[PDB]
Amino acid sequence: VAAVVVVGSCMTDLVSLTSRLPKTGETIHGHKFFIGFGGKGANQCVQAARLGAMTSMVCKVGKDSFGNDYIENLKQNDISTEFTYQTKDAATGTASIIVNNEGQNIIVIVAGANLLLNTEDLRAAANVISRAKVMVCQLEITPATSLEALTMARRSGVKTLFNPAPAIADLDPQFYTLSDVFCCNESEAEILTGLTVGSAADAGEAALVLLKRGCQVVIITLGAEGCVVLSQTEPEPKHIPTEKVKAVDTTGAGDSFVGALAFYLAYYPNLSLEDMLNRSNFIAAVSVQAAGTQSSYPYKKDLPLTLFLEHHHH
Amino acid sequence: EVAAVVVVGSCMTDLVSLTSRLPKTGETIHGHKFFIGFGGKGANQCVQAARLGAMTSMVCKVGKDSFGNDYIENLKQNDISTEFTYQTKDAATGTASIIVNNEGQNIIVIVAGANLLLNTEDLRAAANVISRAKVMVCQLEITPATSLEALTMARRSGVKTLFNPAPAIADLDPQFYTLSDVFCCNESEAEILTGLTVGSAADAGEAALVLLKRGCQVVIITLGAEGCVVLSQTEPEPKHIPTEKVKAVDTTGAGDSFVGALAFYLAYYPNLSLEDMLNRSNFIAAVSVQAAGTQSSYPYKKDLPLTLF
Ligand SMILES: [K+]
Ligand SMILES: [K+]
Numbered sequence: 001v002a003a004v005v006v007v008g009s010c011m012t013d014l015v016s017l018t019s020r021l022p023k024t025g026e027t028i029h030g031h032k033f034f035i036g037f038g039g040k041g042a043n044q045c046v047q048a049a050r051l052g053a054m055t056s057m058v059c060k061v062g063k064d065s066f067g068n069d070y071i072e073n074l075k076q077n078d079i080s081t082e083f084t085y086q087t088k089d090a091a092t093g094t095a096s097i098i099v100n101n102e103g104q105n106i107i108v109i110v111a112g113a114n115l116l117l118n119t120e121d122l123r124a125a126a127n128v129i130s131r132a133k134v135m136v137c138q139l140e141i142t143p144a145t146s147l148e149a150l151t152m153a154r155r156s157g158v159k160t161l162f163n164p165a166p167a168i169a170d171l172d173p174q175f176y177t178l179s180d181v182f183c184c185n186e187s188e189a190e191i192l193t194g195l196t197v198g199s200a201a202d203a204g205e206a207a208l209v210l211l212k213r214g215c216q217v218v219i220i221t222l223g224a225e226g227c228v229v230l231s232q233t234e235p236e237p238k239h240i241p242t243e244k245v246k247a248v249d250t251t252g253a254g255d256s257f258v259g260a261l262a263f264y265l266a267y268y269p270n271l272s273l274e275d276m277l278n279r280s281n282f283i284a285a286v287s288v289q290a291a292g293t294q295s296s297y298p299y300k301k302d303l304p305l306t307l308f309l310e311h312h313h314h
Numbered sequence: 315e316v317a318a319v320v321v322v323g324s325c326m327t328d329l330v331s332l333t334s335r336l337p338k339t340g341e342t343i344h345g346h347k348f349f350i351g352f353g354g355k356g357a358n359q360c361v362q363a364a365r366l367g368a369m370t371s372m373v374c375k376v377g378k379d380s381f382g383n384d385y386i387e388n389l390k391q392n393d394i395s396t397e398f399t400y401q402t403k404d405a406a407t408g409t410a411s412i413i414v415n416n417e418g419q420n421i422i423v424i425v426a427g428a429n430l431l432l433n434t435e436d437l438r439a440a441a442n443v444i445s446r447a448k449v450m451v452c453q454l455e456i457t458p459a460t461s462l463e464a465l466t467m468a469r470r471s472g473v474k475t476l477f478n479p480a481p482a483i484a485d486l487d488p489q490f491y492t493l494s495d496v497f498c499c500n501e502s503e504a505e506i507l508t509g510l511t512v513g514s515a516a517d518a519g520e521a522a523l524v525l526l527k528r529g530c531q532v533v534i535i536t537l538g539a540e541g542c543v544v545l546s547q548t549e550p551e552p553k554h555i556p557t558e559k560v561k562a563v564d565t566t567g568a569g570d571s572f573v574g575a576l577a578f579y580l581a582y583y584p585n586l587s588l589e590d591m592l593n594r595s596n597f598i599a600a601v602s603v604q605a606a607g608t609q610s611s612y613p614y615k616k617d618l619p620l621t622l623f
Binding site: 016017021022025026027030031033069091096098104105106107108109110111 | 331336338339343344346348349350380406409413419421423426427
């Protein structure tokens with residue numbers, strides 16, 4: 001039985017390495033091309049699975065080479081692919097990425113088959129969603145399909161973890177009221193609230209705006225500075241810090257955090273928010289210490305034992 | 315079946331994202347469509363020649379990867395010999411990552427990859443097939459030493475060399491000119507090679523003369539919708555070959571259609587005048603611009619007017 005169900009996106013990463021980023025109208029040469037696996041939903045599902053969750057990825061890829069390769073990627077990470085759909089009507093979602101030697105990038109995402117994940121698909125997955133502990137979704141599929149997944153989860157008493165990423169300024173109000181845990185970064189919080197979010201203090205003002213729209217719990221991540229959390233029960237912002245590490249490549253850190261949080265909500269529901277967030281902050285900070293996105297996500301066996309205690313730890 | 319046209323050159327996977335806006339540094343943007351196509355100037359030329367009825371052989375190197383296996387299949391499906399289509403685990407298949415906005419402005423990143431690892435040992439295996447061909451076609455998308463050796467081998471056997479200096483670089487090895495029986499480029503490439511501005515047929519005549527004096531036998535500069543300009547050692551006065559106006563749907567790949575058509579006529583219609591070959595090639599490339607995509611747009615003999623054959 002899958003405890004963590006992720007309803008969301010898979011994207012093939014098409015990466016070119018160059019010495020400089022091209023501007024409009026330019027043709028340049030790069031020195032290396034490679035393919036990787038991305039998409040916020042799959043990234044989150046991968047981190048959760050690597051921590052030991054029984055996960056299932058509800059998603060749609062193309063009936064194409066990239067799609068077949070993505071299903072294999074899921075299987076290699078011990079993710080259930082019982083609800084990984086294919087479609088002849090769109091290509092697998094893509095992220096075309098150009099990266100320079102200092103790690104600055106240009107990215108073009110084409111959602112593709114992710115947008116064809118539909119009501120009929122969720123109805124077929126209705127039984128798996130209904131039986132989960134946590135349903136995770138983002139905004140890299142059709143927003144109406146994420147709303148439907150949240151609705152289905154709420155109707156079954158399944159905890160909803162909503163990551164409004166990438167953010168849209170005027171989200172349907174039901175996104176907030178159907179969210180048990182609403183988790184975003186500073187740039188997303190800016191789009192959602194119309195406030196500056198650079199610091200912890202700014203994040204607590206933004207978080208309260210989001211809380212009043214009907215979320216149970218709001219979490220705004222702060223990069224290397226950890227995160228801020230509020231809840232209906234505890235509306236005063238808490239700043240949960242992260243011990244400083246030497247970052248190698250911060251790509252994918254957000255999704256690591258969210259996947260770790262899903263793991264804790266499902267497997268350690270007893271734990272306070274503060275405890276879950278310290279742990280999740282730590283795991284994401286491990287990911288930044290290695291190259292790449294999914295490749296950087298740590299496994300349970302390579303992490304400290306204290307991350308897996310049933311009870312609160314100092 | 316003895317190949318009359320041998321192409322020693324590139325195969326590239328075209329990875330195309332269509333957007334409404336081109337990204338600036340640090341930005342993620344969302345586009346509306348992605349597609350994969352088979353490209354590379356060498357393969358594009360080979361495909362157009364094959365669709366006109368040429369017996370062709372593609373000498374190239376792709377990766378031991380999904381894109382490379384798919385490319386070999388693409389060549390076989392277009393009736394091209396893949397006897398000397400190699401695969402290597404040491405680089406990925408060449409890629410062109412192309413981002414195009416709705417006004418047709420683009421950002422392109424080329425990673426030549428496995429193309430660059432086609433080496434002289436790989437060529438030497440094709441010596442017999444090269445020796446028996448009528449035309450050898452090369453571009454500037456693989457490693458220069460390899461293309462130079464291909465041209466050299468062709469010359470040693472009396473095989474006509476058709477060289478396309480594309481993409482152009484300012485200070486090309488002089489042997490590219492002296493090994494070229496027919497040297498064919500566009501206006502932008504001629505500007506890079508000669509340092510001259512080319513914004514008219516007359517200007518292209520001046521640029522073509524520079525290329526001629528560097529040691530080419532025949533020089534052709536294509537002028538987009540305005541046809542082409544040709545001159546030769548035997549007839550150094552530029553001739554402008556115009557083309558009838560058509561409504562372009564997508565001009566991508568038109569140059570390679572032209573070069574592939576010219577290879578076909580050099581190989582199979584050697585007694586036509588150069589002017590006649592160029593009229594026909596201009597026409598075929600103008601058909602290609604009337605359909606979307608690169609290789610998908612290249613016409614077959616059966617769909618073309620009988621008078622071309
Ligand atoms: K990383
Ligand atoms: K075309």
